[PDB]
């Protein structure tokens, strides 16, 4: 599943038993109930530009 369009994940993707797929996030982010989207849990998460995010 992960092989194609990142298994629908925003960040990381893990394959399991058959057609089971788990999305995950980098440290400083948590996964939303949709199971694909990652939301920041910290003030300065990695790979996001505060001055651009604050517009």
């Amino acid at each position: 599943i992960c092989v194609n369009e990142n298994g629908g994940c925003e960040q990381y993707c893990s394959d399991h038993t058959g057609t089971k797929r788990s999305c995950r996030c980098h440290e400083g982010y948590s996964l939303l109930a949709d199971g694909v989207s990652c939301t920041p849990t910290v003030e300065y998460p990695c790979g996001k530009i505060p001055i651009l995010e604050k517009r």
């Binding site: 992960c2 990381y12 300065y44 790979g47 996001k48 505060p50 001055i51």
Partner: protein, 254 residues
């Protein structure tokens, strides 16, 4: 950076400036509060390991505005496979003596997972390359942080599109080509160790390190970057390690 533009202050917040005795050495990328990733070739001629400084939040080299943060580089970690004076395995992991403070001007770039990086990031065409390197081949270095958008090539295409030059190193599986063959836009020697940053679904990631080429913005030639995805496990294992005495440390690769 040749053919780029000035990176607006705070839009390359993970960019590191490496200094030795106060002099411009290389670039680097911040991946968390205490680790910086740069190029192994940046440290080939170092004798004064205690005079290595990493500057975060830097933009204009002529003025101090208060957003700059200086830290001593406490450890330089290089792969066992890297040979000084050569091109392959061009990566260095730097441990800051004390953490940097995350602010609007100092933010890490995400070190991605190998899988994600190889099967998703490796296919994003364009990426940003940045530094205070020379503005032209045999030209003066920039006083303001410069940024350039460059397209990534598959190695087969790079080798086909390039002008067959002798003694020119091979493009290994630990490298990738990115840039332009028309002599208009490139990264340069002074940008060495700097980030090649990839955008994916609202977040930026570390895909490459400014490594080498056949002259800055040479026609028929692209810029060569260290393929960071190959070093994810190697970096992670070391960031989980306790500091060891001595600045330079050579670590087994793989």
């Amino acid at each position: 950076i040749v053919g780029g533009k000035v990176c607006p202050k705070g839009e390359c917040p993970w960019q590191v400036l490496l200094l030795v005795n106060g002099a411009q050495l290389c670039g680097g990328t911040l991946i968390n509060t205490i680790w910086v990733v740069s190029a192994a070739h940046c440290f080939d001629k170092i004798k004064n390991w205690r005079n290595l400084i990493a500057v975060l939040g830097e933009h204009d080299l002529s003025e101090h505005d208060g957003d700059e943060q200086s830290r001593r580089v406490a450890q330089v970690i290089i792969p066992s496979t890297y040979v000084p004076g050569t091109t392959n395995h061009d990566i260095a992991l730097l441990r800051l003596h004390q953490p940097v403070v995350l602010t609007d001007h100092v933010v890490p770039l995400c070190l991605p997972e190998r899988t994600f990086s190889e099967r998703t990031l490796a296919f994003v065409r364009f990426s940003l390359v940045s530094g205070w390197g020379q503005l032209l081949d045999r030209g003066a270095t920039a006083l303001e942080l410069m940024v350039l958008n460059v397209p990534r090539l598959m190695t087969q295409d790079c080798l086909q599109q390039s002008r067959k030059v002798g003694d020119s190193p091979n493009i290994t599986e630990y490298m990738f080509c990115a840039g332009y063959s028309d002599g208009s836009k490139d990264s340069c020697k002074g940008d060495s160790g700097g980030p090649h940053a990839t955008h994916y679904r609202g977040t930026w990631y570390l895909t490459g390190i400014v490594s080498w080429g056949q002259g800055c913005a040479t026609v028929g030639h692209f810029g060569v970057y260290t393929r960071v995805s190959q070093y994810i496990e190697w970096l992670q294992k070391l960031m989980r390690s306790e500091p060891r005495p001595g600045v330079l440390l050579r670590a087994p690769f793989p």
